[PDB]
Amino acid sequence: KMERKNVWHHRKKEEIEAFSKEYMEFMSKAKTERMTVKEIKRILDESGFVPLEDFAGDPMNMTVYAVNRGKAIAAFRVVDDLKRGLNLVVAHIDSPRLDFKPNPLIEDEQIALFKTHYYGGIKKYHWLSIPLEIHGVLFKNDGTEIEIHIGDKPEDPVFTIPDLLPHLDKEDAKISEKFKGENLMLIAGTIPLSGEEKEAVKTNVLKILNEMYGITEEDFVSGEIEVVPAFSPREVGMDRSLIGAYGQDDRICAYTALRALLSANPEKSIGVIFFDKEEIGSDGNTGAKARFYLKALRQILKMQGAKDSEFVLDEVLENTSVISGDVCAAVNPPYKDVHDLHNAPKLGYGVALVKYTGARGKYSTNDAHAEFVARVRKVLNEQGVIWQVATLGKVDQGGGGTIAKFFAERGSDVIDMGPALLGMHSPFEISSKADLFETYVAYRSLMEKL
Template identity: 45%
Template sequence: MKTFDRENSVWARFSEEQRLEMEEYSKKYRHFLDTARTERLANKEIIRQAETAGFKPLHDYATLKAGDKVYWNQKGKSVILAVIGTEPVAQGMKIVGSHIDCPRLDLKAMPVAEKNGIVYFKTHYYGGLLKYQWVCLPLSLIGVVYTADGRRIDVSIGEDPDDPVFFINDLLPHLGKDQAAKKLSEAISGEMLMPLVGTNSEEEKTKPAVLELLKKKYGIEEEDFASAELEIIPAIKSRDVGLDRSMIMSHGHDDRVCSYGNLAAILTAHAGTKTQVALFADKEEIGSVGNTGVHSAFFPDFVAELLALQGHTEELWLRRTMRNSQVLSADVCAALDPVFADAYEETNAARLGYGICLCKYTGARGKAGSNDANAEFLSQVRQIFNAADVPWQIGELGKVDQGGGGTIAYIMADWGCDVVDCGVAMHSMHAPLEIVAKSDAYSGYLAYKAFFESK
């Protein structure tokens, strides 16, 4: 099969057997999407699948040998899986790094507010999103609350078909003269993103009645919201798109389409000479900050623990290991959308359905905030993909000076690793519901598996 082909789609290049494998993979991916709805739920599902495949917590090991399967759970919101290679860890690792957080709305610390007899949730949006896209959708509330006595309560409202949902109003067009005159970015402000919570009360005020419902169902007092992480996401599960069912619509493709490929790859790849590492990080959408983001020490700490179990406790060994390692930064890329063609430079734009996308650089303007992968590593990755019959393409994030964005690539390059962005191209990135092609999602899995198994 021709792996780099700008004339024929991946589906056209696939054999009938490969098309069936792609469909089976897509079913499993959709199940993951509908289960791993938040970063905490993704963490839980990844660990469940890893333990089923024989992975054990790193702290269960006193020494490490080739073929050992270990994982690191970073505060229930990030995960690392590793399969130990025949070579010492210090000789370098094959790392695929993806993220499991997504753009969403977070409830504020004191979220319950009443206006004219209507109770709302006050929210703060998370990540780079277009606020006007979040109105007039059915919404779910998912997360955790810790009560005054330290008891954890898991909350999920809107996911079950019999659950109520939440909803953010927009202005009716009959009264929209002033709104229509505003810039699109100003028509809906952040403080207007307030989901409807309730209206019924036998008292003068409605808020106490809503708080009483929360107390009866979950045992939550208003003060408990101060120690909670509650997220608003679309109450819509994944669906096939198109008469040919060639695409998938879902919340959270960015970056669960790469994360699932990463997970499936490390669970099915043959153990190799190099230690294989699958990183699933939190907080990428807000700059990889916090102690569950890649800017923190948890990933180098994990590598240091691996080295210690192989007899190397000095920091110099950690630095050598990172310099010897190679990374695919598995994050999504923008696919050319003909409806918005003016935002793309067509010659260098990725296309929906043409394979996993290699992005030499992301960043903005003059490559600011970019990793800018070196030609030597790109050459190695091309050879790996071509040898393994992985469909691939090149891409960039729109026209020069049009905008831009970043990934974890530059952070991991700071550790000395060779890194290139390698992710699934998609439409409607960061929207409440996003689109990927099944063939691209499957190509991502093939790419990450081939990379893990390479020498």
């Protein structure tokens, strides 16, 4: 008994392949959280969703969405009274990146550089000597919004933070020292602008930016630009069983959840909420823990006749099951020693059910209740969903931490659930096509029969 089935042996190859190409197409547009919101919203508009604010026409049946500030977005399919509660799948759309500084442009030794400040649990050495592209937006003083996208197009140049050749790198310190956040600067120019006696190369770059976007240097301050890997999603492996791409840290869950939401046949209200800032603690007004979430829900309660928002919300949240959809780590052979094999997920064996994460003895982590796990286990088994238990490394390996805790905090039962990755947080995260497909299945089954 107690054996894990391999998805490739219980699901249609063609179905997996198809769903796989749709995912990667999406991962081609979703490099930042602003692009993911944009890309999700249009998929919603395309599927007949309308802004919750603009909705008119009977609650008890309304498919709407609420965009936070371009950084977060919540989509619901209200099918009944919210006091009946709902099935939610929460995920995050921010991934480790680089981020320009308020004053990014500088020149050092006749070379224009863009200074950055890493974001999230990055691994410095991953971002040295690889083709990067930049995305983001800048506002002119008058308030004109300027979008930037350089590197995603073949006629576009890419950027780079060149490593030091090994011939003159005569000094090996701990991975800690060596690789300083400050030296993560993209080369921006090198060509001096004839006639300038002070920082000719920097000036020239500003000249190009001004002729190209009508922007001036002070416009970087009132703007945000993210540096990401130019690698495009690709199939991986001789058997083409895996997917390689940047930002799979939850965009893989966001995508699957989105899809599950669009094909589900609910019984009670359902929805998905994609948050930002999770990679740095979920602070700010666009991450989990922000009033945003309960505000969207309160808005609905009023349209449904709720007299006392907060009181009614108590039942809404009392009922309502939340699936914290985030990723975990798959046993990586050369480093199998970091896991407890009897509780570590394997690529291809299905969605991982992660009861508790955290660190040093379940510190600051949400631990799902046996009653909830039971209810989740029953729906999955009845729907023939293929899943596997998943722990975040041997007892004291570390890591741990999702957004699930911020939801149990509001009174709802939550459980972490998603596919296992390889090389998480790197510029090219690996995932299994089959698991990617089964997560979608799982989320849909839970949204429906939970």
